Design a protein around this ligand. Sequence first.
Ligand code: FAD
Ligand code: FAD
Lengths: 394, 394
Amino acid sequence: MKTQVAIIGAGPSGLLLGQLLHKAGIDNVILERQTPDYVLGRIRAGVLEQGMVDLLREAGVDRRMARDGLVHEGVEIAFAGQRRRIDLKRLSGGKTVTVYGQTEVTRDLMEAREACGATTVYQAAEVRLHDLQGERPYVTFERDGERLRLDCDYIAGCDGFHGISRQSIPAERLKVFERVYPFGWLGLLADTPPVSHELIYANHPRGFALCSQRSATRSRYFVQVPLSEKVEDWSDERFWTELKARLPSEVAEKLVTGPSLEKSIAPLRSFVVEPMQHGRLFLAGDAAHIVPPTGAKGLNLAASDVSTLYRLLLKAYREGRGELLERYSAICLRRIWKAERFSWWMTSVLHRFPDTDAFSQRIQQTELEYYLGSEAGLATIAENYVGLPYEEIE
Amino acid sequence: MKTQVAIIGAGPSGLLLGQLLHKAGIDNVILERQTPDYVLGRIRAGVLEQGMVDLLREAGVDRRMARDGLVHEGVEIAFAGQRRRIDLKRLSGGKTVTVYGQTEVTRDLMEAREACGATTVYQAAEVRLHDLQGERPYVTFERDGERLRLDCDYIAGCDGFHGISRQSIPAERLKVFERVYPFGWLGLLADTPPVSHELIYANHPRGFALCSQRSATRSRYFVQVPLSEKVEDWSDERFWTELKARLPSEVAEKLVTGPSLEKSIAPLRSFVVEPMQHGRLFLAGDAAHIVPPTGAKGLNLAASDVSTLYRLLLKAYREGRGELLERYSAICLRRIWKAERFSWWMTSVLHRFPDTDAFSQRIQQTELEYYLGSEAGLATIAENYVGLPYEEIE
Ligand SMILES: Cc1cc2nc3c(=O)[nH]c(=O)nc-3n(C[C@H](O)[C@H](O)[C@H](O)COP(=O)(O)OP(=O)(O)OC[C@H]3O[C@@H](n4cnc5c(N)ncnc54)[C@H](O)[C@@H]3O)c2cc1C
Ligand SMILES: Cc1cc2nc3c(=O)[nH]c(=O)nc-3n(C[C@H](O)[C@H](O)[C@H](O)COP(=O)(O)OP(=O)(O)OC[C@H]3O[C@@H](n4cnc5c(N)ncnc54)[C@H](O)[C@@H]3O)c2cc1C
């Protein structure tokens, strides 16, 4: 086979880049290791920046999101009994965030790609990338036992943290920056109405807790948990009791509980590689970077990498300006590092870190008191939470 | 002897509290371990908040400060080649800071106390504090071999970090919060004109550097130095070469160097005790807390503790409301912890910390890029730098 852009991975990154590119007339073939059902089983993210919302609109995949997505105008941070509201809309100059599940975004995109007849190969086994520095790079994969070859101009590695694309770059051309946190989040999806119309992040002596949602009758809750915890040690009931013990009484009292639809533990990590490209191969999303979920930036960074790779490729094809693609990593890294810094700070102030001395505990408490009580402090969280502006270029 | 308020220490804290109290009609006796000359030899601080300026005016000790003090409207932070200016006046809503040396403030105050005839006992040896919980606490000291007793109503411990007043509180009534940094500052006073009309804080791969001043022909420079450094290993010339190597070229080029009037190394520390009182004894300034010098908050916290202890005592005597003095530590601690947080952050972003991994280095660089390029980021530094409002009470 032959295509113009080969996309490895059919998660949100690959599908968005795929849709945008197709609508613009740049053929693209997506290769995905799992089946469609497997991909749709992943719960994941729930908070979308205005920027990602506008990108779904541009791919023309926003009908259901505009219908069912919920626009949030603020978030609440609870600490030491207090519950402070950050008016995102007011403090950001009118921007807001949208709650629409990643599973749903992935669904909308997959449906859109089918309807337009673009190519997607599922169960593409053993994908290998070749001649990344040549003028004619290519991908080989196995489909029902036989090895096939796809020739393309460029390759977009949208295959997540464990994807083959980042491992295909000679290790010596890359610089890795990583911090592993000593805790993870234990998450629970329940078919129950949410405890608040906005999200609640809670710093409690017992450990972090987060009250989120997917819609008016679907909730998502998280508790900080030690790295040794196994999910089978957490019955629905043990979870509910722990969530309640970490929330302020007036909130824990209104909480409608119920059996879990899904329960899973996800460790926290910060990861960035520089550069994010090598020859004809460009990494986007989780393939190039990981942020802890505290700032809801994962799916949002993937969107910005994609919006960026797309606009550069658009220039490369429609305008013949292929030299602009060298600017990908620089553009992307500026936004990435700021979101990494925001996620890191958020994680630092909301979580209970082990073996922490008295001074640092007081500093953490004072960080919250200052930032949540200063108009300038609130504006720094707010502008970062809704999402900093996407870069332009030319 | 007998007095109403016994003040231990004749540094800035003791003298300010002493002057304010005298002018209001509350007699006070100051006890100081060293001689006046010894006290006046200490170089120390140079940056005063508006709040401390107004306090010097209230003690009526501002003639020379208004004359010779310099009002700074901004500071500059240099990192990665760039030189960013934080317009303090604009971003703080019109507040500024004043550069007038601590030695000079101490001088002005000492002169004022002499002229008014208030009591100050120098070379007061072996000061001991007694009956702190009684109704009649007292201080004993040795003056030329003989032991004397001073009876008072209250005792203000303004004796610095190594003073006797904090050690007089039963250790079990106090909670200490401390962080020791793995570096100190090597400072140099030179009779040369300053390299800028405003201060310059510099983060350089080689370590922190600060360009400060005392007047139009007197400069003060600092370099971060390892905890093992001995001042005798730093000749004037070695210092100048190191300062230059840490500043941006256009600044290092304008630098007028010269022999040092004074050279000394001061380690960095964060220290807070809670509470700041015990019975009839109240701690103020360095006796109760230490901040690293990066945020210029030391002398400024001492001033606010003093402004607070004074207004409470004023109520106690002139209005009979002595129950208000129990509110001292709470009022003081609110302002103290925020300044501790600001000093800690400042130190964290401007200094080169040993054994630092790649991720943290990038986060530090990104902290600066974000805060110095966001209007909300700049406002958080600015409002904190000029000084957060003093609390009111009643
Ligand atoms: C398990 C996990 C849980 C998360 N939970 C949350 C959460 O609760 N909240 C939140 O805010 N953020 C969360 N995130 C972050 C957010 O969901 C991600 O940043 C986002 O999915 C990024 O999308 P992506 O398309 O770049 O990669 P992914 O969504 O991971 O998709 C990449 C795709 O590439 C495929 N692939 C992998 N290897 C190959 C191969 N060799 N060949 C072909 N295809 C391959 C994968 O099967 C997958 O379909 C989570 C991330 C992970 C990994
Ligand atoms: C050595 C050092 C260097 C500093 N350098 C800087 C600098 O470069 N820049 C900056 O911003 N900040 C600096 N600071 C911070 C700032 O100068 C202080 O926070 C400030 O001096 C606080 O004033 P104070 O009156 O509370 O205590 P101090 O000024 O320390 O004065 C307390 C006084 O109490 C006296 N005393 C001690 N023990 C007894 C006793 N047993 N009986 C009676 N009297 C006693 C002392 O002799 C001293 O006179 C420095 C602090 C120190 C200690």
